[PDB]
């Protein structure tokens, strides 16, 4: 019951996804080549959510690994824990898109799609009850942005009522690892608008900041950053994988957190973000966690929630707690500074409490916010697009792959509309 | 005869049931296997040589909670086919509970219910446990109620509804779910006993000295109330009360059947030795707003009907005197059209003590069922909550996409308004 | 006296027989050699000092299945000349079963049958096991039936036919085989008890909690039915029933002799201790469509004749009351021209438990034989299936080449149509 | 009871046949020169289906080995396992046909036939009950195609009611190992049309594909390819050689799978096709097997079943299973996508379940499909024939051996008719 398909597209997705798999396997007591080292019946009970079980009690992720560039695939396999993945779920093209969204979306993506589709169908028919999909990818590159969205579209055509989740990394203004990010982001976000139920917006800059100032680390690697993301991912789905006191699946959160179909971009935050030298000077507790979760510093999306308003917030807590305590904390948060909580939605807080905490720490919280402040992120991107598009810069590459001016205009328009909608409700 | 069957719907319904049944087993000397080491017949059937089995049915559109039941301390108490599960939950969507997902499981549960009825000789009624805010506890319950009406229009049906106060809300769409389900409930329920989490929490901190109440803690108290209610059915008393009686004595008018249950005394192990536990004292405690299980504004309204269920060592004369005293107090107000306001019931069983529990053993106890006009305020606040959300069509897409039409909401609202008006009227 | 002889035809016939005979041996304290460590006389003869031997005949136009019998746990139970084999099978071709290949083996089996008859003193009847879809089980059976009619026109002949539901079909030409054979069966059978594999499977999953039923599993259940049927012949009861009785009590009209057998209770080892096994309860179970051994649409038709064979500890009064209750239920419909619908039979033997089995030991059990108009629907669907295939002459070459003419098929179809019409008529 | 004659004609037949013999011997515990190493009574019980038993408990195949070219015979004997064959069953001519069908069918075949006939008669009269014949050969070459068909004809004259089986390799369009394949195929298929009960159509291209993409092998040899064929052969006749729960002999399948006399060309498929590195990540089970069997990838004939319809399918499963499970799977297959199943035949699936699985794997399936998609195979061949025949190319060689234009015309006509018939019922 309630079984999920994972998908990883492009470089970022593949690496983040790997990390996620490492984490969740660790949580459920699974070794890399080793079949089972779990300590508890509970872990065993819901292995079938994310895994399949071959002969002699082996276990294997319902995960699909996709990229137009062969190299990253090589890296993934070459890592320790690489033997756990079914070899038939490695589905890569021959030549990479090279940060050309159009290539991702037309020339190579189309050629790639069929194999992917077949594998997804196979995965579906294998299992009794299909819940949802989880895609990890970028909006800044050609493959993750272009092909990913195509894939999503295809999926939608097949199963209209199933859940679509995406964990999407986003562009930031000061740090651009590609000059054509405005275009790439724009095109892909349009596509997302129509086919996703919930989208988790994640910024690298924010992550870096967190690593530097909160965790007090001088040398953050990508892996470290990815760790947080992995943790967040784990947190979201804890309700499906463990018996709690109050349980909230993917669907539940979606229903709770989306007042209008269009506005389904969630800003995740996480607690507690402790440092190594600094942890022994804290009393581990509900209120502290709650206080941490609503700081602008712990928003993984680089937007200030001070300049917008929360429509809705979902709080998923792990470890034993007093539900009453949690509720009182929530109340305190709401009444004290209701300045950033929308009046027409009376109670803006959703709570889920799951009994099994992550490995390492005794109590933890994941915060998922639908904030009107997210419009700010889109605005900068829009501005950048405008700046580029007026001079027709770099349009020629996109033209060369089938694209035409009209599409760009339309996507931008859509984005603008979205922005306006967010503003209106603020 | 006179048997009664419990139905547990959704998470709330299940977990409450868990405590309740445990309590019952302890009361009748039933170990967690099923052997005993008659009175209890009204809740437990017998089959085989010595094994006793709960007349209970557990329903959930998701396996999570009921899986724990299957693999816990009480795994052997229930036959596996009295636990129905397995599917996608009504994700806090009334419509799903009622239309899409309720449709697939209904027949199986109904068959089970019928079987249970057939096992028994002339059972009086049904005890239905659920929340209003859950998609299952809301949508499915109404559907089930309908079915029960169809089958046994005559028989009594009582419910325990977990009602949400706006300040301790844990779900975004609690207002819609509550309103839709309440309308449906209205026509097919004989009476619905409301419980507020916040009130319970308050009680726990003040009178049990516990700062950190868990859900597990809360349920124990609720179970005790249930026990108090049905003890007269299960045991020999001096003066008795049944399910039929409650309907008769609490409902002046068809639509006005939403009374509050209160309980006393609620005491920690420590506080008892400095406690003169009087019959009068507990009665007094019963009418003090801090002891209410629903936060309602009790002093502003008037009382219409009040049932006092005593259990333990009691002198009826003393009870009578206490009642008289209560009547004589000026601030407590009864409706002018009812001079005599108390139904009184007595039970020779001392209430029980749960191993590892919070509650002290007491020799006298009371559960009061009381119907006040003040509870209308709760509905008013809920309606207010609903009205703003409705205004922008917030979260409407989820409901419309599940085979529920939009005018339905409006109709429900209208009904609620009318109900509210009615309370205002009868209080004059 | 009153002896009865079993004939097993084709694979289905043989494997069913295997289980049945095993069950019988266990019941009468017969070890797999043949020594015992009278009642049983009706099924087992005696020769030598202590050895007991089945009055059974096994026929197959192929050695495969019966070779296993020859070299298995029960090799020593049967004398080698009661097993006839050796040749090419009727490759799912009715014609081969009936004309080409049936011709060569018939005399040998008939001689054996005669010998068996002669060994006994005034045997009542024959129990014939087979499938309708097999070339042997179809074509040969009809031929054998003819022979039996010729020899002993008077005596009773009962059959157990494995009937195919279209959704769980394992053979391409099942429709032709079934239709041709059924016509032939019509004139020479006293009654034919239909069994559907799909129904059995359903029963196994729901009420025995087994997800993966094998053929071996299925047969056990069938054997139990057989045992229930013939227990009254083999044992002392309070009220008895014989083969002659069934013919009398189930057949309002010559052509309408195709009743369904149902069985209860069907319980796993685990579920029994949470089970109040009542006489009424089992009766109730008996009339619930999920317990039918043929998927037939039971609620749409009416019941014409119903035989209830109880075994174990039973109070006749209780049975009577159960019957009355059943009658009083509105949805179950009997034909207006029969007021009193139940033949009731009682047997002091508890049904038996097979070592390594799926079924729990029970103290009360029932086998119901019931004739409903609804079974006509099955024939209609079969006819529909036949009609399209016939339309293109699909697979006709195989039949024509075996000495079967084409108009025969048409005739058979016509007969089936007439039969169908008849059911429609008698239901008014 | 139920005893069979095996025949191998031409190069392909001889090699495939050898492989088959190796397999079946292995299955029944027989060593190459060694008399008996079997582990079970079951194996012993039905040795007499395919073997004879000389003094001191030796065993020998009822197999006949035929070729116009002496060389292949030499190869066969020279291999290990070559001592098991009775020397009197080696029946070879002097000079090979050289891909001239006419030579195969007239000049050398006729000279060869008598010895073959005598040996077959000898084999028949030796044994109590004769079931059928199994011929392995090609349609692309001179001997397998021409002489084989002559032999078949002769056999038919003798025993009209006995079963004829042929395992026939077929030409493919992109890979032609002879330029005169259209002619050869045409002439032989005509002959097959009138005298065979069931014909198993097998393509090399398909096999190659399977080896490359499914088994993930870089270097397929002919032996490897032949292995699959051998396995298939073994699967077909498992009902004759073992006690099952449901049993289906050669005749049973034939009756079940041929709605009209003309349409007796079966497309085999097999499961499971597992790779070496890839096997440990599968739960071995009925449903998986069923899913594998109906993929276009696992059709051994290079035709797409997506562009035709199944008239009938026979499924032979080996190893312990739940018949119920199998049936439910079948139902699922039928109802879900009935788009490619003919309406007038209500249940198009035949099932046989045999208890003894092959050596290596625990459960396995053989699928035999009568698909209207087979017309596509014939069509290309027909087209090629047309292309050649218009220019009269290479006709002269055939003329030189007795053939005349009329024969070619007639065979082509017949083929066309056959094609039409398949289409009509689609
Ligand atoms: N959170 C992370 N973000 C990353 C990581 N690596 C890259 N990125 C971000 O992703 C952006 C580009 O994504 P990719 O590297 O996957 C390039 P993509 O495969 O999407 O398309 P091509 O460039 O055509 O291959 C880049 O601008 C970075 O801001 C990582 O390990 N973690
Ligand atoms: N499946 C296999 N097919 C083969 C094999 N060897 C050859 N062939 C195919 O068979 C075709 C020709 O068959 P042969 O080699 O037996 C030539 P044949 O003896 O039939 O006649 P001549 O050419 O006159 O000797 C050729 O075009 C190949 O496509 C093999 O080992 N396996
Ligand atoms: N008193 C009490 N209330 C509970 C408990 N668990 C949940 N609730 C309340 O029930 C409501 C949430 O609905 P659930 O009972 O989970 O509803 P459900 O029928 O399981 O359906 P979903 O919520 O959609 O899974 C909230 O108002 C909670 O406060 C419990 O153990 N005791
Ligand atoms: N109930 C039951 N049915 C069976 C069994 N074996 C086969 N069948 C059914 O019988 C039919 C197949 O025919 P068989 O019984 O094998 O017929 P046969 O008389 O042996 O002749 P052939 O099938 O031609 O060998 C199908 O409808 C099967 O579902 C069994 O053990 N139990
Ligand atoms: Mg890349
Ligand atoms: Mg729930
Ligand atoms: Mg058979
Ligand atoms: Mg050659």
Author numbering:
A (entry chain I), D (entry chain K): 1 to 426
B (entry chain A), C (entry chain B): 1 to 37, 47 to 437
Paper passage:
To gain insight into the assembly properties of α1A/βIII recombinant tubulin, we determined the structure of α1A/βIII microtubules in complex with the GTP analog GMPCPP at near-atomic resolution using cryo-electron microscopy and single-particle image reconstruction. Overall, the reconstruction has a resolution of 4.2 Å (Fourier shell correlation, 0.143 criterion, encompassing a resolution range of ∼3.5–5.5 Å). The majority (92%) of human α1A/βIII GMPCPP microtubules have 14 protofilaments, similar to brain GMPCPP microtubules. Despite the chemical homogeneity of our sample, there is no density attributable to them, indicating that they are intrinsically disordered unless engaged by an effector as seen for the tubulin tyrosine ligase like 7 glutamylase or the NDC80 complex. Consistent with the high sequence conservation of the tubulin body, our structure is similar to that of heterogeneous mosaic mammalian brain GMPCPP microtubules, and the overall conformation of the tubulin dimers in our reconstruction is consistent with a GTP-like extended conformation. A difference in the tubulin repeat distance is observed between α1A/βIII and brain microtubules as follows: 82.7 ± 0.2 versus 83.1 ± 0.0 Å measured from the EM reconstruction (i.e. model-independent); 82.6 versus 83.2 Å measured by comparing models, for α1A/βIII and brain microtubules, respectively. Nevertheless, we find two subtle differences that have the potential to impact polymerization dynamics. First, the loop connecting helices H1 and H1′ in β-tubulin shifts ∼3 Å away from the H1′-S2 loop, which makes lateral contacts with the M-loop (microtubule loop) of the neighboring dimer. Second, when one α-protomer each of brain GMPCPP and recombinant α1A/βIII GMPCPP microtubule protofilaments are superimposed, a clear displacement of successive recombinant α1A/βIII dimers becomes apparent. This propagates from the exchangeable GTP-site (E-site) and βIII-tubulin longitudinal interface and results in a progressive stagger that increases with each dimer along the protofilament, such that the first neighboring dimer is offset by 1.7 Å (all Cα root mean square deviation), the second by 3.4 Å, and so on.
Microtubules cycle stochastically between periods of polymerization and depolymerization, i.e. they exhibit “dynamic instability”. This behavior is crucial in cell division, motility, and differentiation. Eukaryotes have multiple tubulin genes (humans have eight α- and eight β-tubulin isotypes) with tissue-specific distributions. Here, we report for the first time the expression and purification of recombinant isotypically pure unmodified human tubulin competent for in vitro dynamics assays and report its dynamic parameters as well as cryo-EM structure at 4.2 Å resolution.
